[PDB]
Each structure stands twice: as C-alpha cells, then as structure tokens.
C-alpha cells in the first residue's frame, strides 16, 4: 500500500483526494486559478513516511510561484494555503483558542509578558475576544503572510 505521516504523528495511507479539497478551500471564490495547475507545478515527490506538513509545504511554494500578472488571484490563493499551516502549527487545530486562555498559556511559556494578565481581568479579555475577527486572516496577500511567519 502507500503511506503518509500526518503532522499529528500517526500514520495513514495516501489519500490523493484530501489534497484536492485543500486547494479547493483556497481556490474558493477565485478565478484564473487552476486547482490542477498547482499540483503539476509542484512536482511533489512522494515517498513513504513523508510528513503531511512537508506535503502541504510543497503546494504553498508552488501556488506562490504561479502568482503572475495574468493571475493576480494566485497571490491570494497561496495566501489561504499559507494562513492554514501557520494557525495549525501553533494551535494544534484550525480555530485559535479564546483570547484569555491563550494570553495566559503563552505567559508561563516565557513568550507573552504577564504584564497583561494584571492590567486586564478575564472579563475584559473575553470581551475583547468579540472584536477579534480571526476571519481577517483570510484577507492577507501571501506577500505579507510570509513576513508574518518570521
């Protein structure tokens, strides 16, 4: 059979379909964007125990390489494929945790300054969570996105 190594760590058989659906999520509401194009562009080389992360990585660069003047949307196409990876590589899951919960977690990790947990009570935090529009992450053009990743 064929193998694959989900970012989770566990193993799986190759599911050629699951890829397509991903590109779709991106091509959603776009034009001049060929779902089949990016695939062949990427010359994604399969080999046993390949990590799912790496596989996903390949398409990101591939879609970014098809960002031509004639294909302005591709800039946003790959952008969506990118935002996905990031969020999941920091949250375990596609939907980020509540403002409060997160702020605290990262505090004890040395990454966020506890300075906030003191100047803002849980209520105020959970309130600000309302203003937060995670969906705005889907309004980035890959150019900007890549910079954010550093």
């Amino acid at each position: 059979n064929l193998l694959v190594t989900k970012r989770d760590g566990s193993t799986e058989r190759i599911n050629l379909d699951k890829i397509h659906r991903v590109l779709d999520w991106a091509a959603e509401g776009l034009h001049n964007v060929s779902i089949s194009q990016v695939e062949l562009r990427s010359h994604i080389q399969f080999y046993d125990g390949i990590k799912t992360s790496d596989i996903h990585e390949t398409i990101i660069k591939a879609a970014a390489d098809l960002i031509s003047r004639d294909a302005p949307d591709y800039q946003y196409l790959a952008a969506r494929l990118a935002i996905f990876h990031l969020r999941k590589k920091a949250y375990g899951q596609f939907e980020p945790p509540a403002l409060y919960d997160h702020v605290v977690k990262m505090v004890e990790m040395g990454k966020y300054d506890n300075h906030l947990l003191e100047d803002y009570t849980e209520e105020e935090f959970k309130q600000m969570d309302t203003f937060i529009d995670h969906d705005r992450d889907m309004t980035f053009s890959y150019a900007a996105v890549k910079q954010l990743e550093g």
Binding site: H31, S34, S36, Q37, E39
Partner: protein, 356 residues
C-alpha cells in the same frame, strides 16, 4: 445514381459541398473553397510515422505506475483506440458518395488516411507497455463504458449509409417492398448529414481533446513519454480535422453554398444543440471510470470534468450553437504546451542660469 466518374462536364466551381454530380476528374488547378485545399497541404506536411518516436523508457513506466493510475492510462487509451478505428472508415463510406467538389474530395480521403496512422500508433504503444495486445484489444470491443458511447455516434454514420443509399438506388416519395413503405426525401437526407457531421465536430473537437489531457497528464509527471510524444502529433493532425468540420458546417448553414440547407440549419438548431450538450456529459462520466479506484497526482474527476465545460463552451461558440455550459477559465493551462506548434558632463553653461 452514384458514378465513380460522372460523364458530364460540370463546372465544379459551383457544385455544393455535398449532393452534387460526383467529381469527374481529380484536378487541383482551382477550388471553390481554398480552405479544404490548405487542410490537405498542411496535413501532408504533417505526415509522420508512429514508429519514429521511441517507446522503450515507456515500458518500465507502466510497470511502475500505481494500480489506480495504471487503470486511468490503459483505459483512456482504449477509448481513443475505438474513436479513430471507426473514424477511419467512417468519413470514407458516409461522406464520399455525397462529395460534390474536388478540393473537398481529396481532403476526405486524406482526412480518413490521417486517422489510420493514429490507429497504427495506438497499437505500437500497447505492445510496448503491455504483455499481450489481444487482451487489451478484445476489450475495446466488448466493454461496459466503451460500448455505451461506441454505438452512440457510430449510429449517425450507419444511418447516412442507408438513407443516402436509397437516394441513388431509388428515387423519391414512396417505394413499397414486402408491405413496407420507405420514403426518400431530398430534404430528409440533407438533415441526415448536417446532424451526422455535428457528431464529428464533437468527437474530433471535444471527445478527443478531452482524452488528451489524460495522456498529457502523465507527461507533466515525467511518465509515459513516448505516448505523450505520439499523442501530441495526434492532436496536431486533429486540429485540422475539427477545423474543417466547422468550415463544412458554417458554409452549409450560411446558405452561400446550399440555399436549401440554410433553412435546415434553423429546424435543426435545437436538434444539434441537444447532441452537443448531451454527448458532452458522456465524457464527464468516463472520468469516474478512471478515478474510480483513485485520483492522480496530476488531476482527478473534479478537474477533468471542469475541462469538458471549458472546452465545449467555446467549441460550440464556433459552429454557431448556443452556449449551455457555464463560462470558465481553463482549469488546465499546462495542456497548451502540447497543442502549440508541436516539435560625466560638466559645464557652467547650463548651470549658470538656474535660480535656486
């Protein structure tokens, strides 16, 4: 009555596309429609022998390609094999007896001959990548996906064979044999043509061009090279085909050649539109037969389907028919690769004047 040589001296210049005194002499000094003449020349120069391109590296490829993939390629090849196998004879018995002008005639025989090559090539491929030719051939004749369209278009030909036959063997109105009355009407035959040919524009425009994105798919994967090389040439020689199928349709609908047909184009407008849109669907299904076991790193059922819409949407905008499939941008642009032309001053002078 059909005569291999017509006695009469008849000025071809005026003979309609079809239904005209059978061409007396093979001349080329002139033409009524320069198009046909050119299609012949460009084709003649496109001549090529399938044995030329090497198939060695391809052999190991099939042996390696996964099962869900092996199916995709051997299956789509069977589909092509049949299309031309029939197309080869088809143009020759169905149209010839109707041919009325020289330029068009020579083209037909050439058009047909061109297909024979594709037929020969497909054979040269199978022997290389498979162990037994027969097993693959005997299936192209008796198979569930294959036969389903096989009879579809192949019917239009068999029809214009009998229909047109009674127009010569027999006159018009009613003749009764064995208690059966069969009518031959001139107009009843001019339609059995206009519809039978719109079936080819589709088999040589959308039906085949769709079966190419599949073969060229492995090409962008560095697999089954030989086939891609041969298939490319196929598409090229094909370009000339559908190109003519249109010039033959457009001029027959315009009436600039056949006044009567001018009307038949309106009372068949909806008729032809049906076949086009309908036949197009047959293809979308075929994909399932290939991507049934699994998808391909190059494309899957989803993608391939989008193509049929993009191609048929324009393919029909040429013949003059109405557009049914939604507009789109070619899902595959990588395919174009295979249908393109296949192989210091200083002064105080100017300064003095400025007033900072």
């Amino acid at each position: 009555a059909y005569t291999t040589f017509s006695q009469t001296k008849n000025d071809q210049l005026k003979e309609p596309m079809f239904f005209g005194q059978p061409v007396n002499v093979a001349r080329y000094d002139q033409q009524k429609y320069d198009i046909f003449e050119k299609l012949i020349e460009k084709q003649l120069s496109f001549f090529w022998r399938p044995e030329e391109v090497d198939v060695s590296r391809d052999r190991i490829d099939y042996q390696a390609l996964p099962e869900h993939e092996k199916h995709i390629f051997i299956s789509n090849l069977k589909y092509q094999t049949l299309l031309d196998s029939i197309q080869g004879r088809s143009p020759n018995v169905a149209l010839l007896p109707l041919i009325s002008i020289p330029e068009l005639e020579t083209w037909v025989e050439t058009w047909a001959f061109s297909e024979t090559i594709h037929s020969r090539s497909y054979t040269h491929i199978i022997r290389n990548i498979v162990n037994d030719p027969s097993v693959v051939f005997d299936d192209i004749v008796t198979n569930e996906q294959i036969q389903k369209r096989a009879e579809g278009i192949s019917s239009y030909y068999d029809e214009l064979i009998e229909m047109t036959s009674y127009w010569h063997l027999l006159g018009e109105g009613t003749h009764t044999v064995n208690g059966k009355t069969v009518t031959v009407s001139l107009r009843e035959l001019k339609k059995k043509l206009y519809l039978c040919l719109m079936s080819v524009n589709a088999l040589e425009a959308i039906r085949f061009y769709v079966s190419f994105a599949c073969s060229f798919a492995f090409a962008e994967r560095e697999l089954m090279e030989g086939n891609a090389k041969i298939i490319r040439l196929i598409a090229r020689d094909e370009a000339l085909h559908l190109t003519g199928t249109q010039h033959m349709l457009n001029l027959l609908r315009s009436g600039a050649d056949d006044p009567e047909m001018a009307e038949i184009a309106e009372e068949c407008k909806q008729e032809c539109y049906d076949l086009f849109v309908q036949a197009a669907q047959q293809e979308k299904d075929w994909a399932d037969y290939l991507f049934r076991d699994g998808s391909m790193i190059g494309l899957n059922k989803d993608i391939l389907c989008q193509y049929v819409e993009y191609i048929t949407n324009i393919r029909m905008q040429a013949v003059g028919l109405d557009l049914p499939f939604q507009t789109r941008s070619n899902p595959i642009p990588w395919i174009n690769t295979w249908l393109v032309s296949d192989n210091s001053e200083v002064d105080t002078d100017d300064l003095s004047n400025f007033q900072l």
